[PDB]
Subunit: 329 residues, 2 copies
């Protein structure tokens, strides 16, 4: 038998996710034998007749320019948003058959650590949520995305990466073209959405449910605040209004009476059940890559581990080798 | 402990599955209808109008808009699946008795995520990429599921669809023919997995489905139901395409994983067929007759009440 700790590293782009993950996988970094699963980049650019990275931001240009109807521009955007998801769903279907069960917090160092660049939450929930709040996407499209989030089986750990805005923009800046513009509005919205995610999991871990405070909560003004730089944070004890659930109390989902339809309630039930099994953490990436790797590394004692066998652990290693080689550039 | 038999009534449209379902409910029987309101009524867009109106291309951008609409068909199915899968219970077994409760669902997630799209790249209206996209979103069927594919001789099917259209309408006959082939492939896939085999058994010794295979899959009566089918009679066969292989002709591992998922997700689907030639009451009788061959799960009193609540709500919210 083999003890396994699995970690999804997530957050806003340009913070230092991949670099931290690669260092964590290194071996110069010590700790437990670690396997890194990078972003499925080939899948997006190189394996099919289209570059989904192109399309996404490009559609936001064609719509601005007046190159495609705004009704069409919300539709082809959505389809690309959908394509981001596919490789994550596939990786998830594959590896969940191998983690094993017996989730526990065992405190000791595992036989083996897995590190995934991004959890399926990123492309099915967070990124679409951002786009909906900015007005690039409808509620109906968001629900299309959100419904495709898979259930996390027992044992999962998600580490959301944090960083002060100054340094984050500075980090994007160094990596940007000549005098290329940075989308401050998107990052600001994406930064809040990830705080809403961290808050949500805290909420659910404290035994609370999306109905706890629903009647009192105002209708979702809300979208203004969602784009406001630093309007949201990691909260000690989260209230419904600090979580993702709050964006769903809007008119498009309610009665004539003002009561949410039971069918959208079912949708919020599913989002809850699906995030239940994600043990949540924060990691500040202020340091150098080495120091970042250590900030995440020191979260291990509170992390959940599963018991798997030697044959599955090997199957996870071939998976990682297969994934790295098939997803590069 | 309440004994539950859930059946998914599925197949190509315009045969009479909804009608059959409604009659079965009139052993107590619940009927979950299609999420019609969800698709047409609850939001600004009409996905049934949309996917038809998007075919005002009759050729490259349409393929992306029709693929997005396909996603929207799926949404309410994933929502209903997530709510009910909690309540069915475990202990799957073919007990051969009349259950305390039988659930009739209009269609399974497999229709919208696999059959209509999931490599519906077939008519060339959608791409392998857009396909993998839908197929990946197929939910895992928990133990005890039963699927009944409705079959109908093509003459009576075409008649039914015609005696339902108005002054200047069309029937996408070429879509109807393809769907009839894809649903046979679905039946065969389940028989094949039940037979103990796996998508790899026959894979090397299968011709690369490229160009010719798609054209064959759109001909009326090109496929049929077989108890012992060849790999080429299944949904697995359509994924051996140049688009998914490397230089040396071997399927990439990531694509292989997608076939495993599809495989695994279909495992607990006990498949049946039913001929819908007769009257609505006869069709229901045909389906009712398969009951003692089906899987049943053991649920608690509280969960079966929740399922009864589920159907009342769903019929209430999804009408028109």
């Amino acid at each position: 038998m083999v003890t396994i700790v699995r970690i999804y590293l997530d957050g806003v782009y340009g913070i230092g996710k991949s670099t931290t993950g690669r260092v964590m996988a290194s071996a110069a970094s010590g700790g437990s034998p670690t396997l890194y699963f990078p972003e499925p980049m080939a899948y997006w650019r190189t394996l099919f007749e289209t570059d989904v990275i192109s399309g996404i931001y490009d559609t936001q240009n064609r719509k601005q320019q007046g190159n495609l109807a705004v009704d069409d521009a919300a539709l082809i955007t959505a389809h690309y948003q959908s394509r981001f998801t596919t490789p994550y769903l596939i990786l998830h279907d594959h590896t969940c058959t191998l983690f094993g069960g017996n989730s526990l917090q065992r405190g000791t160092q595992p036989d083996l650590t897995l590190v995934f660049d991004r959890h399926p939450v990123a492309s099915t929930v967070c990124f679409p949520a951002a786009r909906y709040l900015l007005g690039d996407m409808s509620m109906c499209a968001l629900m299309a995305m959100v419904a495709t989030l898979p259930r996390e089986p027992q044992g999962g750990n998600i580490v959301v990466t944090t960083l002060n805005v100054e340094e984050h923009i500075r980090r994007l800046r160094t990596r940007a073209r000549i005098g290329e513009q940075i989308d401050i509005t998107l990052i600001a919205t994406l930064r809040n959405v990830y705080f809403m995610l961290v808050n949500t999991c805290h909420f659910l871990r404290s035994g609370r449910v999306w109905r706890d405070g629903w009647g009192e909560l105002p209708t979702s003004a809300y979208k203004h605040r969602a784009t406001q730089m630093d309007a949201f944070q990691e909260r000690v004890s989260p209230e419904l209004g600090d979580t993702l659930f709050a964006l769903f109390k809007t008119q498009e989902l309610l009665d004539d009476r003002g009561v949410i339809l039971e069918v959208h309630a079912w949708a919020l039930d599913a989002l809850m059940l699906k995030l239940r099994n994600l043990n949540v953490f924060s990691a500040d990436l202020s340091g150098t890559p080495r120091q970042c790797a250590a900030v995440v590394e020191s979260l291990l004692p509170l992390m959940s581990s599963t018991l798997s066998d030697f044959d599955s652990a090997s199957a996870l290693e071939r998976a990682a080798r297969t994934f790295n080689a098939e997803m590069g550039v």
